[PDB]
Design a binder for this molecule. Structure first.
Ligand code: A1CI8
Length: 333
């Protein structure tokens, strides 16, 4: 078939048997060698070349040989599985970046690989490194002119995904490299929203430390409101020690957060419900409009209005729960 030996070459590459590879290649014509190494191979659904799976599997030895003696294109693209998913438009450098194989990444950059290559999703190898969180690669990739500002097909910046996958030190890095903190995603989010919802205290600090705009996302939710709906009390108290938000905004977050302690399934604390809801009851000579009891839901109940109204519920494990659901419906729908 001739293409059957192509599979043997792909095998040794994927398996890192650089011995097996070398002995397969030598004594063949350039016509032959360009083919064998150019063969796109669909092991299952994943279409890739010998160079790629080696970088995808961190096999430096075979990668070095392929890049030098046989002189293979670094721009070869394919479609590689990562945690079940098939990503498309990926080069060997995109694979080694996400796969955490530094030595291969260096090699691949050393032999003239596009550090700014975009996948079909428009994911730079720097993004893959940011998703994975291997700071050495990010450092190296950036120090070799990987553009930090190119983003996802949905404008998900390298900074966001790292703020999402809690890569605190990678985040501080991108920030030191003056990554734009107030870049906004399609859904309207900033890296603050991502970090707040994910409860990454350290990252929220660095984000605010770099003059993070408190922007409103596509849902119309500040990172404060998001972090309270995701029931991330720690974050919510941090952000609230930076005025910026009104008195209305400060209360809504408190109530929301308190509500999210009774609606949340994982974290659930009716004591922490009667705390953020009692705090919310603000006074002076001015106050703050409830809704009708639902056709049957929520036990046909009305939210508390007086601070005295609320106090009487400190001890009703049940009614407090119901109160939280009512509060959520008000500030959500
Ligand atoms: O959702 C994602 C994550 C992708 C990814 C997938 C596997 C390993 C590294 C990175 S890279 C991207 O931009 N989009």
């Amino acid at each position: 078939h001739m293409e059957g030996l192509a599979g043997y070459v792909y095998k040794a590459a994927s398996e890192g048997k650089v011995l097996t590879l070398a002995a397969l290649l030598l004594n063949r014509s350039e016509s032959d060698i360009r083919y064998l190494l150019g063969y796109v191979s669909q092991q299952g659904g994943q279409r890739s070349t010998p160079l790629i799976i080696a970088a995808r599997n961190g096999h430096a030895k075979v990668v070095r040989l392929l890049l030098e003696h046989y002189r293979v294109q670094t721009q070869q693209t394919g479609t590689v599985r990562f945690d079940g998913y098939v990503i498309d438009g990926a080069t060997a450098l995109w694979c080694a970046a996400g796969a955490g194989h530094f030595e291969v990444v260096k090699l691949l950059v050393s032999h003239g690989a596009n550090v700014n290559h975009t996948t079909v999703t428009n994911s730079t190898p720097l993004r893959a490194a940011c998703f994975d969180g291997r700071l050495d690669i990010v450092k190296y990739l950036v120090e070799n002119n990987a553009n930090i500002s190119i983003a996802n097909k949905y404008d998900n910046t390298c900074l966001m995904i790292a703020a999402y996958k809690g890569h605190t030190d990678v985040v501080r890095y991108l920030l030191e490299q003056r990554a734009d903190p107030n870049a906004k995603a399609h859904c309207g989010a900033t890296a603050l929203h991502f970090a707040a919802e994910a409860g990454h205290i350290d990252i929220v600090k660095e984000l605010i430390k770099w003059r993070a705009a408190i922007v409103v996302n596509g849902h119309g939710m500040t990172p404060l409101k998001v972090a309270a709906e995701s029931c991330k009390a720690d974050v919510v108290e941090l952000l609230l020690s930076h005025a910026d938000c009104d008195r209305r905004s400060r209360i809504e977050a408190l109530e929301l957060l308190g509500a999210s302690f009774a609606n949340d399934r994982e974290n659930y604390d009716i004591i922490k419900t009667y705390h953020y809801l009692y705090l919310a009851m603000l006074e002076r000579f001015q106050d703050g409009k409830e809704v009708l009891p639902p056709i049957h839901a929520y036990g046909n109940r009305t939210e508390c209005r007086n601070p005295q109204e609320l106090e009487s519920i400190r001890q009703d494990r049940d009614a407090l729960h119901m109160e939280g659901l009512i509060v959520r419906e008000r500030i959500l729908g």
